[PDB]
Amino acid sequence: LEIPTSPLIIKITQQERNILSNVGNLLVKAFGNYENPDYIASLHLHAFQLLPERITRILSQFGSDFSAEQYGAIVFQGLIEVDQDDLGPTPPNWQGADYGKLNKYGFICSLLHGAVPSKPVQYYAQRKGGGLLHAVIPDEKMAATQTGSGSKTDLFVHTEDAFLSNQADFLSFLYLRNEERVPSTLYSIRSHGKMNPVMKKLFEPIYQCPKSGPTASVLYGNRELPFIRFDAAEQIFNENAGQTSEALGNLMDFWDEAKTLINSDYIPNSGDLIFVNNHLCAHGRSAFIAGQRIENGEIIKCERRQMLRMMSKTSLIHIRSVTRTDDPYFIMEEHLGKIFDLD
Ligand SMILES: O=C(O)CCC(=O)C(=O)O
Ligand SMILES: [Fe+3]
């Protein structure tokens, strides 16, 4: 067994980059925007027909790969060319993002999800939906917070929406800007190798997954090669987590083993995309001061970090009891089965 300790790195070629750009432009002209119901309905057809063949092959292989050798993450280096001057300054927060300017990127990202094959979705739990594509920008008003809008503190490794029974299957993180040279942290359940006594206790549905309350298993799926639902900040380093002495102990014993396996080697460049199997690989990023980097004992001022996130589900059927009646891509789940009580 070759235990995976790092993600697969794919160096995108100039020809691939040029195909993606032309195909992105074409889809913008044809459908207006990536949330067009006609485009979403024929997504997989557009993905398999319009993407560079090597991208399609990589993502198809990845979608059904849950083997011992599979890390659960891919870095697509130089997927897109970002013209920094055209992009202009980073808005003060995600609310200031110009999705008219990010439209082509949303098309490109949705094609990658559609080749898994997987369908982009939105969550009421995340910005009351906020669309299929989210701009992740450091907000000065939320500098030391444990969110995507944060900066000043370490964003602990977590799988996305550990508190939801219908959390994303796949995630894409498109880096438009990372001039602060913030490392992206990744953690795979596969980095542990063979099933062990510490891991086995996590299959027990005795754990709190904060958004008494309902409990769930941290490990699920196959007993030998499991899937993971984990949030270190929310489940372990939270005074209000409400874990039992037994569960907290198990989580702590697990965190001790897991923290040595966290990979912080990759520093994304502008135009890089990280593609994640949200059932295998947790993500985070180190602390940073937005709009600056330190080099040879001097402060270098720069444009603020800007990343685009897209989430997807492989089945609209399984999630149908938690989606909107008139939108099967809009997840209304609040906490482990419970739906948001709105009206
Ligand atoms: O900034 C990052 O790379 C990760 C932020 C994050 O946790 C997210 O978009 O879910
Ligand atoms: Fe996240």
Numbering used by the authors: 19 to 229, 241 to 372
Original authors' sentences:
We have focused our work on the iron(II)/α-KetoAcid-dependent Oxygenases (αKAOs), a mechanistically diverse superfamily of enzymes that use dioxygen as the oxidant to catalyze several reactions via C-H bond activation, mostly hydroxylation. One of these, KDO1, catalyzes the formation of (3S)-3-hydroxy-L-lysine, while five others, KDO2 to KDO6, promote the formation of (4R)-4-hydroxy-L-lysine.
In all four molecules of each of the KDO5 structures, an iron ion is present in the active site chelated by two His (176 and 312) and one Glu (178). In α-KG bound structure, α-KG is best defined for monomer A. The carboxylate moieties of the co-substrate form salt bridges with Arg338 and 334 (2.9 Å; 2.8 Å and 3.1 Å); the α-ketoacid moiety binds the iron as bidentate; the terminal carboxylate interacts by H-bond with Tyr193 (3.0 Å).
